[PDB]
Design a protein around this ligand. Structure first.
Ligand SMILES: [Zn+2]
Length: 279
């Protein structure tokens, strides 16, 4: 009950006649949180590894050495974490730090052992993890939801009314590549990232969760700004957006998602806002 599947990169021109079911196979991770299991995917867009760890009875660790050609998982890599589930803790090189809901952690390169645990076996913590390669070691930082920064954004005229939470951000901390965040749209608002953009120099991954209703749906937009497609998401699913693709979404109700951005730069404003011509 450990899984890591591989996904490739593509030309924009490669996906152009792609059907939905194969669009979903290349870009969408359908199952992320299954009790007791580790579910991760390895994308060749800047080699991001993301997925989820849901420990229940016995604690879990992402144990990967030979597969990545190293002796331990984070020998050459950094790792972000946000817990969207129940109460838990992670022990990091022995230091056990409790993790309550929407608490996050940045763990830099060189950390040998990271064990995730849950406190209650039937109300587990859901650890959404993102690991990205790192050439320099930076300090570990716990990112409490209490300390988590809340920025008002949106109007109801644009149906984007929401609150963004910065977790791993270059202005508040030092990492190599990884940037992480969390967005809750308020009820009555469905649009995320709507005035849209592409960033040639880095990529992003959206993971949608906490759907308002069991029947809620998210339509995540994808593709090159002139040629766009969409994928339809159930709760707790994720979509890799390559550097040449835009990324936005709409729900039938409100929801939340975590964004994880990485690439060769951390500059936030190296990006092209797509004017509204999208065919
Ligand atoms: Zn972006």
């Amino acid at each position: 009950s450990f899984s890591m599947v591989t996904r490739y990169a593509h030309s924009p021109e490669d996906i152009q006649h792609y059907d939905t079911s194969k669009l979903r196979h290349e870009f969408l991770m359908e199952k992320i949180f299954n009790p007791g299991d580790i579910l991760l995917t390895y994308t060749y867009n800047d080699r991001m590894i993301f997925g989820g760890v849901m420990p229940t009875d016995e604690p879990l660790e992402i144990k990967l050495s030979t597969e990545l050609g190293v002796d331990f998982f984070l020998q050459r890599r950094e790792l972000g974490i946000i817990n969207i589930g129940g109460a838990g803790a992670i022990t990091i090189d022995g230091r056990k730090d409790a993790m309550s809901n929407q608490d996050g952690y940045y763990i830099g390169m060189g950390t040998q052992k990271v064990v995730f645990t849950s406190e209650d076996r039937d109300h587990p913590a859901k650890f959404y993890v993102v690991s990205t390669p790192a050439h320099k070691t930076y300090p570990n930082k716990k990112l409490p939801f209490a300390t988590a920064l809340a920025k008002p954004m949106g109007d109801q005229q644009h149906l984007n009314k929401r609150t963004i939470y910065k977790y791993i951000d270059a202005s508040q901390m030092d990492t190599c590549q990884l940037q992480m965040g969390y967005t809750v749209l308020e009820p009555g608002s469905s649009w995320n990232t709507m005035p849209a953009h592409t960033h040639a120099r880095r990529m992003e991954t959206y993971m949608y969760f906490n759907f308002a209703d069991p029947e809620t749906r998210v339509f995540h937009f994808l593709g090159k700004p002139d040629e766009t497609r969409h994928i339809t998401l159930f709760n707790e699913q994720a979509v890799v957006n390559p550097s040449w693709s835009i990324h936005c979404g709409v729900g039938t109700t409100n929801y939340a998602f975590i964004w994880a951005m990485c690439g060769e730069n951390q500059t936030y404003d190296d990006m092209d806002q797509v004017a509204m011509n999208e065919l």
